[PDB]
Amino acid sequence: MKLFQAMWTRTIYSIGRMVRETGLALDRYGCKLEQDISCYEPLSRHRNILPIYDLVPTFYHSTFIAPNSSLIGAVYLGQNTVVGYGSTLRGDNHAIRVGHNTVIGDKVAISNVATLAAGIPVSTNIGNHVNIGAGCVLQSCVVDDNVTVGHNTVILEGSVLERGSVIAPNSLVPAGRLIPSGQLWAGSPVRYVRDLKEEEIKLNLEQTEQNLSIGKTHKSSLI
Amino acid sequence: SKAYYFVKNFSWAEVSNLLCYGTKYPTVLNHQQKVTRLYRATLRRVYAHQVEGYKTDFKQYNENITDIGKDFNKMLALKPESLELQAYFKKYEDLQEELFDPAMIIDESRPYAASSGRYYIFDDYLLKFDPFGFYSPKLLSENRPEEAMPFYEDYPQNDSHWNLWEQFPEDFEDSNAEREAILKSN
Amino acid sequence: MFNLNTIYLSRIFIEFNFYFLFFLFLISSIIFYFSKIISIQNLNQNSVFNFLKLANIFGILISFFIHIISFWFYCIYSYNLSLNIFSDINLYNSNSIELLNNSLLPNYFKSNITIDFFGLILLTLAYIVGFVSILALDTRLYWKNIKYIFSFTIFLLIVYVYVTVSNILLFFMCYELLLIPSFLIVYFVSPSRRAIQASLYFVIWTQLGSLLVLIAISYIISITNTYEFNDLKYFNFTNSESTIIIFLIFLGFGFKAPIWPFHYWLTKTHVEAPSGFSIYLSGFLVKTALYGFYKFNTSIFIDIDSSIFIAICIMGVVDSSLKMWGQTDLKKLVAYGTIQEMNIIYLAFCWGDSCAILGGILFSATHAFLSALMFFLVDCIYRRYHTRSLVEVNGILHITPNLGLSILFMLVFFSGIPGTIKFISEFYIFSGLLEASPFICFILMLVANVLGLIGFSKSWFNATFGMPKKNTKYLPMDLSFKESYIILYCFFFLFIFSYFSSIFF
Amino acid sequence: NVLLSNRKNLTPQESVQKVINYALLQDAKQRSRTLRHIKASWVIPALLFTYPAWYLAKGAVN
Amino acid sequence: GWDRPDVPLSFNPLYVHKRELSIFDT
Amino acid sequence: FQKYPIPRYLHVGQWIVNKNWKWNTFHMFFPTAILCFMVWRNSMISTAKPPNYGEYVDPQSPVAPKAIKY
Amino acid sequence: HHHHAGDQADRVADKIIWINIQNRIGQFERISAFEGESLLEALQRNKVAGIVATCEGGEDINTMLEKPIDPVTYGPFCSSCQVVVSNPWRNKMGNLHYLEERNLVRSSYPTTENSRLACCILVEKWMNEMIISIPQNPNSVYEDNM
Amino acid sequence: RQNFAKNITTTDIPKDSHHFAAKRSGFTQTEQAPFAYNDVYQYPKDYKPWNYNYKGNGVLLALFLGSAFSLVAYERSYASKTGRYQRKVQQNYYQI
Amino acid sequence: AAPPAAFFLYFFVPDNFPSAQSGFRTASRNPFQVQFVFAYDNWEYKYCGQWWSMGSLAVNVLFFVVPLFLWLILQTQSDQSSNRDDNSLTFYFSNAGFFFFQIYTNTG
Ligand SMILES: Nc1ncnc2c1ncn2[C@@H]1O[C@H](COP(=O)(O)OP(=O)(O)O)[C@@H](O)[C@H]1O
């Protein structure tokens, strides 16, 4: 019975597409007949929010999304979550879920792999109070709460980062690896570093809160 | 020693060389090697005919082996270019030919024996093979991804490709719960 | 107690099965074309290809099922029809029954459907061999060439129209229509690089044969301005025209059903073609030449001696069977076996409409199933060991024993144990040949059933036995359920069709 | 929403297991929705264009 | 008596094909 | 021959002992006997036999061999 | 190749095969090529004048560059990639394929006994510092100007 | 390559997690990060890989019903062939 | 003999989909085995008339003249059938073009 609703939705969408195309073509013909060239303007075609057919990005009013950024497909954002300048989140294949009070840097690129093994989520999941530095690349990974990732870090498919762990800048987490809670790891073949202390965790939390506050201030200034 | 005398398309000259010497090409052997190999072949044949025979006489066997030993001791001390050594070689090759049996007893330990290779022995590669996980545990991840490699599923044993679209339970509730919740929130 | 209900059941089933297949094909084609812009596989889980696959498989199976019931109807119909004219001994009455037309669908190509036993045997072979071949082509179809999933439904439709017409022109057109799909399959689906030239060889020989058949058909059509097999009863051909026609049709149909001097194309095409299409080519396609020839052989009065044609067929049998020893490739060996039994079948049609045609009709189905089984076994070996040469693979037993058991049982069935239809066909043809030519019968029997059998058996036994020592890190697993059931069904069909009704044959 | 829900009261293993299960369930729902949309995209052309194609073929042949 | 090891894999020696297989010896 | 290991994945029959072989033997033997009994019972309908000792075939009886009237 | 775990990559400079060329205008050129490649591909990548290469190397399945030449090959198609190879390297090249000789002797411009079609040459190790000459090749069809 | 999904919805895959435990603690400065999932398949413990694990009655019931229908249909056909409403059973039957 | 260095190998069409059954594990091939696999297909004659004497001239001639022998034997046995009034080697025409079991009905 829901197939009938899907069929009706597709028919309505196609008719709307036809109407829009016919209107734009008539406007271009009017251009020409009027010796107008406004419709020849080569403006940028970039869209801040690009929804695939039924995959529409969804976020709260409290989220900051840079006009340079690109959320495509099923991208779900929690409250007080900021995406930096030029970041791309492509959930055309599978969804990208981001928790609340999470900061995503400028040149972070998040995508998903086509298929994975049984029991491994193929989408991207990011918890709450998570800091991701600029220049990071993320693919089909699980990041728990209160996790900091340094700049220019690559996290591959099937990776799991437990709560409270820290990844040093310029690192790589190999595919299908677990990084336990409350530990610091560094290296491209990422290697174990001594367990975190209370002062380090407090400083990381304060830095994440300050970054979120600065992002909120930037969003307020932009509007 | 491989006993492939008759299962390869050999001529008599090759078989005679293999019977007298452990090779088809006795010209690449030293003088001592040739003498010792001919002595061993002659003693083997005499044992096969005068100890494991039909009506065996031990006294005659002892006499013949003593004479053969004397002759081969003379043979060893000669020079390779001498004609007497060549005559001795010819005599004992003729002796090997004259006692030739189309029904030689081949020891069961030889590579091409009658009962050789009767069983296929499985190596550790086949013993440790288990695609499905009944005998050895199988990960749901199907493999352990090594570093510097992407995580990819193993190739299945049966690549049928005769599959349908994904099957779901009847009356499966698949509404956009997250989208509805967020839209209700704002 | 035969009445009009059975007559109309048979006719309605014959026509409506075709329309069922055609509507399936049309709906699937529309879905394929209008779903996407490019009409190539999307390489994801929700590809239309999946659906298409199921559809095609579905339809063939279902149509086959309907066909079976349909086939049974015809049998009874035909039987009683003969009776209705055998017992009409009173001089005042005559069987004058005139039927009506269905009000739901039109007659395709404005023709009245007529069917015979051998045509429906050909249709059944098309159904079964097409099902097996399409099952043996899943791995070959992928990105940018999935369209050829539709080929076997098109083959079924063409063969249906071929076997259900009394129009000699539509007959020839349906025979000619079979070349383009075959060439396309060999050209675009074969993985081997040598298949590019093999397709050209296939085309050029098959088209030379088609040109000869075309000359004969044009002769018949121009001399007698008619397109019905019935009208040929009221026109006589002179000796010269009859000789020309019989020579032309014999040579043209022997190009496709490979007679002695023309089998190079068949050998190359089997060696290079994909396994599924090889199954279709040996199992069914060559049989299309036997049918048409038979029709054109039976509708004309020929006053020539058939010794030359019989000698050509026997030379084909001898030449093919003498070459089996010196084959190391298994697929080439299966191709040579196909050649010898095809020539044996083609021999049976060299006496006109006599009782020799029954053995040929049965042995056509026998060869269809035997060749399908042998090529499927070769495909299984090739996909397991990545080779089909005796010098590279042996000891198929002791590792994956089911394949070796299948090979041995295939060898038994090919040898012709008296419990199957191979023995029955051999008995028919050899009894007739012994009466017609004793020394020829003995020579053919000795050459085919001893020398060729020994070569075949050597090449197949050596691969089954031995020790597979070379690459234990890459040794394969045994048969899957699909292959096991296909092999078992081939064996079951042979054994159980040994029990068909004796009114026919 | 398990992801938006507070999970600090659990151990990290429990939290990651809960997140993984929620993600798998949502993935299955999204897969079902996309599959039904593509099924509708298949179904519509058949109903729209099967009769005109049959009309074309019938007018051509008989 | 003596704890014998498992049956050795040398019981099935591997052939090495020192010579070419002629098509006249098929 | 000395025993050597057989891979677990192979469904081959080297040195196999089934611990439940008695029940399997029972459940393969008795239904086989019943099936053979049914086959024999069917086949005794079409079984011939010469006359017993002390009996003669009357040439004019219906069971006696017959010729054909043309 | 042959490498072990942890080894560093080799240098492209050490793998370069050098070709020495006399132009159609009497000037000298030095060209870098690699093994497993045809001479035509190296010459065209290095933008060497004098070759027309109308057929652009021929077909793609049964080519002249495979070490055993397949019998049912069609051979070169335009004979417009001719070069002249110096004595030692040309002698090491060997006798010509009959199809290549047929295309060489049938060209509209004069040839030599050292003439050799570039797309029929597979670059080898022993061709380092090989000396060749490329006089201008003939034009064939209208589209050669386009 | 295969593109189907493995996280099915019809049922949960039988598995156990006690096998292949993760380390999660006591790491050195040179070893690799531990793996994540580690779950392995669990078989029903009554499964025989060497035979069909078929415990149904549907195939036997269908074949038996088909054979019984064949018998009754033959009885009806024979009764109709002799021009009778039912088979006339003779008082004595003899070898064919 | 040294292992072959140049020989005909296996080849596949561009963009071929590989066969991936049983885990898709392919081993290295043996040069002598591949050489034998592809030797016969590419073998050819060297000069005109080489075939006649290749092997046994008498046996090759006998093989060449086989079809004539079969035709002559068939002719002799046709002579035997003619005087005994046996089945001759002719296309018999006794059904007047009516096919084996063919439905012959009318409409109207
Ligand atoms: N392909 C072949 N063609 C011709 N002769 C062969 C071939 N293979 C083996 N032979 C003959 O069989 C013999 C096999 O000996 P071989 O097993 O190679 O002994 P070894 O392993 O000690 O060299 C050789 O001496 C050779 O004469």
Ligand code: FES
């Ligand atoms: S480029 Fe055409 S022949 Fe070389």
